[PDB]
Amino acid sequence: HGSMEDPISRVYRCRLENPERPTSPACQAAVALSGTQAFYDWNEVNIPNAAGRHRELIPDGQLCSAGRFKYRGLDLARSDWIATPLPSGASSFPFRYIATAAHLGFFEFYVTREGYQPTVPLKWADLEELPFINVTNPPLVSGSYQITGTTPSGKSGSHLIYVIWQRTDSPEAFYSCSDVYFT
Ligand SMILES: *[C@@H]1O[C@H](CO)[C@@H](O[C@@H]2O[C@H](CO)[C@@H](O[C@@H]3O[C@H](CO)[C@@H](O)[C@H](O)[C@@H]3O)[C@H](O)[C@H]2NC(C)=O)[C@H](O[C@@H]2O[C@@H](C)[C@@H](O)[C@@H](O)[C@@H]2O)[C@H]1NC(C)=O
Ligand SMILES: [Cu+2]
Ligand SMILES: [Mg+2]
């Protein structure tokens, strides 16, 4: 159980804005759609069944909810999701995935391709084909996994990082969307 902490996922950020009275316009819209309980369950954007079959089980336009109607507020294609500034072509960004319960598993990091439009629902073809980080059981430190990688280098502006956490002792996987701004 968990989600991305840095850059922070939509689901965990909206939780931290308080589901009872959200502060950012995008989270207001998201909580209005999904209701509050989904956001208190920010750590469980999962498919208990995945077994690595992400593209098969998750329809286009439902990447951020992982095809789960419960998390449909995360699929909103808004221009005003709050984004984490991120350098393009750098190896020092402190990536963090907060785990309420650690698991045996690996994390695949994907970024959106050039010419991604935040105003269009996220489709599989909006992401790069290959992950820019794939890491098995990275160090767990103070409740968060610390992950190192090089960000792809010819990027600027509003993008998204999609993190898939596939367990190795279980078919269960977790799915995280993080809004970022390359700069
Ligand atoms: C990201 O990294 C993980 C490993 O940390 C990749 O998963 C592993 O993929 C290996 C092959 O590329 C799998 O091993 C081969 O598996 C079978 C086992 O029966 C053997 O026949 C064969 O000789 C190899 O041993 C390995 O099983 C798999 N590990 C786990 C726990 O699933 C991962 O690959 C991706 O997801 C897996 C589940 C498969 O769908 C892979 O094809 C797929 O590439 C890496 N992800 C990427 C995108 O590269
Ligand atoms: Cu868990
Ligand atoms: Mg690595």
Side-chain angles (χ1 to χ4, degrees), residues 107 132-136 138 147-149:
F107 298 84
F132 67 99
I133 303 168
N134 187 3
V135 65
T136 293
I147 292 166
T148 50

Side-chain angles (χ1 to χ4, degrees), residues 1-3 10-12 14-15 29-31 33-48 61-76 81 173-175 177:
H1 281 51
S3 197
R10 289 178 180 173
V11 75
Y12 184 41
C14 294
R15 169 71 190 87
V31 180
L33 199 66
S34 273
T36 51
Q37 188 52 226
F39 294 89
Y40 296 116
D41 307 343
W42 60 269
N43 63 350
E44 202 180 71
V45 185
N46 71 341
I47 295 181
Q62 297 171 53
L63 271 71
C64 297
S65 68
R68 302 272 308 284
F69 196 75
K70 172 176 185 187
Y71 296 104
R72 66 192 173 286
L74 304 182
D75 297 321
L76 293 175
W81 287 109
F174 297 79
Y175 303 89
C177 285

Side-chain angles (χ1 to χ4, degrees), residues 100-138:
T100 60
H103 296 316
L104 296 164
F106 63 88
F107 298 84
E108 297 172 359
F109 285 61
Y110 297 84
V111 79
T112 43
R113 294 155 179 285
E114 292 298 84
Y116 167 66
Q117 290 314 319
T119 47
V120 182
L122 192 69
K123 303 158 283 193
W124 280 102
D126 302 317
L127 297 174
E128 292 298 17
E129 301 207 73
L130 298 197
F132 67 99
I133 303 168
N134 187 3
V135 65
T136 293
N137 296 312

Side-chain angles (χ1 to χ4, degrees), residues 78-114:
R78 305 179 55 107
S79 351
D80 60 356
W81 287 109
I82 298 181
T84 299
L86 188 41
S88 181
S91 60
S92 302
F93 191 81
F95 300 101
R96 305 286 181 263
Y97 190 106
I98 181 166
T100 60
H103 296 316
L104 296 164
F106 63 88
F107 298 84
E108 297 172 359
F109 285 61
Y110 297 84
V111 79
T112 43
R113 294 155 179 285
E114 292 298 84

